[PDB]
């Protein structure tokens, strides 16, 4: 039944890791096609019975924020482009236009009068205006999580189905900085038949062009059969602009961009301008243009040629529509009537191109190669590798992952019920989905926008977080109150969220202290939510106003707890040291919460006059020369002091960790008898070149290998508790923390690069694992791909996106680092892993941004560090291009991305409170997730519909015996099911009507969507 994703190496024509190993990457001058060669063709190839069919496809690339905000661009440019497109297409029936960004289209359409809405629907229905992809945005492919790529695709396509009655099946991605196979994975499971990409390494374009492998069936790296394959067209030249889309010579192609004659303020850098087409020049002009087209056609296998015609924010003025259309019409009339050219040229759309290509294929005219792999790291020229944007603006990269989880939790918690319109649930969820979707743009999460635009994205995401909080807390109140008591005010705050890691300690003072006291309030209810479909235990912490607090469940059973101080780190501008201060009135209480699958659990915190029976207190040790006292109020244990020294810690029966006198990990011992395995954390800095090209928001151009950060004699704080222990150290630019709860440690870095201009701070792990030149990184949080370090390429080319994790291994040992935020990283030597923390750059790097990166702010980065023995694991063979996590590493990743949510009851007494929700929910096998649960209907619908996206990962078999778990059938999670359907991942098309209304579980590495219908 299910394909084996481990043991069968797929046979493909092009495998990108193998291609990389073989290629020389020489940057030679190819002539007018600077990165290619002088293309030759046989004029006799095309004749009366075999013509070249040319589709000229007008387009306008509209960024939802970059140099201006979304709203600024909409007012100044996009509203005019769309208004003039409507008029010109209406009036010129043979003219065509494609549109990608639905965020702008929806903004425009809703402001149109009814007459114009009808005119717009007519030019879509008749095929003159065609939507390509139909996502909210054209997303980044490096830093984006697959869940958010799907979210933004669904937001745009749901809008298009409702208002335009169309669902695109061809994708257009002309600007993201490199390309991921996560895109065809999602698109192929969402009804698509074709896709187009542009930004791939210039050496790759040359190699594939020589073999006519620029069109290929792109399958996943583990897919032996090919059921994931999606037809893909890679454009051959340096850019998507008119000079780089007609053919190989931009000096010639520029003369066919009729906006560049002078009155529009544009010109041709190659110093030859366009000239208006006339009867006296059309033959010579056609001669030049057809020659360019026939050269481009030599790079592809069919007699159908794609010629994009557009650029950034084009087709804005009426006069521009006229100058492009009339000049091209004169060229077509001449070319199509001159038999000697053997060409038929016309305006077309993207779907028309692909339909004609496949007609040629079915006629036996061409066969296409198969391909697997990715297209990172991109370089557009010379040594200019775009690995900087894997890290740029890391505060907002972390915010993306926080909001990702809040959107999932808000949609899931509120899906369980139908809500009255007055509750504003659908309104708040639509706002949250749209702001997160907007940020997936290739100038949003990438960190490549102007400072004021980054601020706009941040403000939008903050409003989205508040919307999610409102929906979540209303839902908890409804799910856990006796129904005959429940009395909602839909504007009221019944609970506030408590989040320990966002914005984070030392970033914002945002958390509420639970205030208890004999003369005010003896106790407080708290509630935990678990969005994952299995029972889960996790330590949770709250701030409380007394150390004498104990925890009970809602059967009044005692729960073991630990109290620790609240520690904050300060850069002391007087003593010139970085050191911790403790609160004398706020304390942390920590306990293990146990929560049902997709469920809720209630606990109670109660004050007493002295130390409670079931609460313990951490010890605290400050290691520094020249200590001063550290009082802690009522906290029952005095802080201890010492000179810096090596130390060792063990929580529970977990690993024993040893630290240097500077507070940095040096070894991990997995069990009592086992070796102390060298595992060393180190912080280093990269700089910028003093001559030639400078690093900026896009480009990483280091001045050689990194240099160690000079640490001095830093202050180290050791907290030792029964449930949780930690070592924290104040280093220059980073407060580095290692936290132990009985399994793999959690690492937290509070990163403040301050005023350190032209500096990139990296965190490195040094081990003696014999990894050689191999390492693994993830793509969009979906799959792990094998990387090979290449010493034939510069340092920055060996940097890859780390959207959620990375690992190295040898025959016996693996080290995996999981992340709570996308960052850039590599393995630059055998046994090493490294990941960039932040970067501050004074210079612009010549890609259009027009500023450096000087707007850094403190960010709390989070990680888990998993050392494991892998000698017993069933792994792929040496030639397989994928890798897979273990159970422990996968659970560690879930602990970072989808932790328990914590709610504090906001008033004194919760009347009608219940102890648990979801105790009867199935606890599914650990590799299965309910990635999305979303109610699809409003309360007035007779038949309610709920959509689910189910994802199964693939975990290594390493000899841990399987325990039986329960089958998860999402179609029976809500009562009164009347129908269950398998759908596309966007929920927009029914694919299968399911027997017995049962939704089957999916295979490893597969994702499916189901919709259940319920009689209400
Ligand atoms: C030399 C100049 C004119 C600055 C230039 C440099 C690069 C490009 C390529 C297009 C760039 C690539 C980075 C990217 O951030 C931007 C925006 O998303 C916009 O849509 C154009 N894109 C176009 C033009
Ligand atoms: Zn762009």
Tab-separated table of N, CA and C and ligand atoms in Angstrom, residues 61 63 66 175 177 199 240 312 386 442-443 448 698 846-848, ligand 1:
chain	number	residue	atom	x	y	z
A	61	UNK	N	4.583	42.645	-11.806
A	61	UNK	CA	5.006	42.065	-10.527
A	61	UNK	C	4.708	43.082	-9.395
A	63	UNK	N	4.623	43.702	-5.441
A	63	UNK	CA	5.035	43.267	-4.088
A	63	UNK	C	4.122	43.806	-3.000
A	66	UNK	N	7.569	46.273	0.299
A	66	UNK	CA	9.017	46.133	0.052
A	66	UNK	C	9.687	47.488	0.365
A	175	UNK	N	10.064	35.700	-8.498
A	175	UNK	CA	10.982	36.471	-7.636
A	175	UNK	C	11.541	35.830	-6.340
A	177	UNK	N	13.857	33.882	-3.681
A	177	UNK	CA	15.331	33.862	-3.876
A	177	UNK	C	15.859	32.412	-3.745
A	199	UNK	N	14.381	31.983	-10.150
A	199	UNK	CA	15.642	32.310	-9.486
A	199	UNK	C	16.373	31.065	-9.034
A	240	UNK	N	13.440	38.264	-14.744
A	240	UNK	CA	12.109	38.196	-15.366
A	240	UNK	C	11.729	39.477	-16.136
A	312	UNK	N	8.351	45.095	-12.627
A	312	UNK	CA	7.763	45.546	-11.351
A	312	UNK	C	6.732	46.644	-11.559
A	386	UNK	N	22.877	34.276	-2.032
A	386	UNK	CA	21.832	34.942	-1.269
A	386	UNK	C	21.523	34.136	0.007
A	442	UNK	N	7.816	37.297	-0.212
A	442	UNK	CA	9.276	37.211	-0.387
A	442	UNK	C	10.078	38.489	0.001
A	443	UNK	N	9.397	39.547	0.492
A	443	UNK	CA	10.069	40.655	1.221
A	443	UNK	C	9.588	40.791	2.679
A	448	UNK	N	13.882	41.487	4.032
A	448	UNK	CA	14.437	42.296	2.949
A	448	UNK	C	13.631	43.570	2.622
A	698	UNK	N	20.341	40.749	1.730
A	698	UNK	CA	20.254	39.544	0.893
A	698	UNK	C	21.521	38.680	0.939
A	846	UNK	N	22.925	46.193	-3.206
A	846	UNK	CA	22.693	46.362	-4.661
A	846	UNK	C	21.584	45.487	-5.274
A	847	UNK	N	20.582	45.132	-4.468
A	847	UNK	CA	19.407	44.390	-4.971
A	847	UNK	C	18.106	45.198	-4.891
A	848	UNK	N	18.224	46.508	-4.650
A	848	UNK	CA	17.083	47.430	-4.701
A	848	UNK	C	16.542	47.939	-3.375
B	1	LIG	C1	20.190	46.647	-10.000
B	1	LIG	C2	18.773	46.903	-9.490
B	1	LIG	C3	18.080	47.903	-10.414
B	1	LIG	C4	18.849	47.526	-8.094
B	1	LIG	C5	18.010	45.590	-9.410
B	1	LIG	C6	18.536	44.505	-8.501
B	1	LIG	C7	17.736	43.285	-8.468
B	1	LIG	C8	16.575	43.131	-9.212
B	1	LIG	C9	15.842	41.806	-9.104
B	1	LIG	C10	14.453	41.929	-8.464
B	1	LIG	C11	14.410	42.141	-6.939
B	1	LIG	C12	15.095	41.007	-6.158
B	1	LIG	C13	15.014	41.250	-4.642
B	1	LIG	C14	13.576	41.492	-4.150
B	1	LIG	O1	13.606	41.926	-2.790
B	1	LIG	C15	12.918	42.580	-5.005
B	1	LIG	C16	11.454	42.909	-4.739
B	1	LIG	O2	10.690	41.748	-4.325
B	1	LIG	C17	10.969	43.438	-6.108
B	1	LIG	O3	9.830	42.716	-6.621
B	1	LIG	C18	12.158	43.273	-7.090
B	1	LIG	N1	12.994	42.225	-6.451
B	1	LIG	C19	16.128	44.153	-10.061
B	1	LIG	C20	16.836	45.360	-10.142
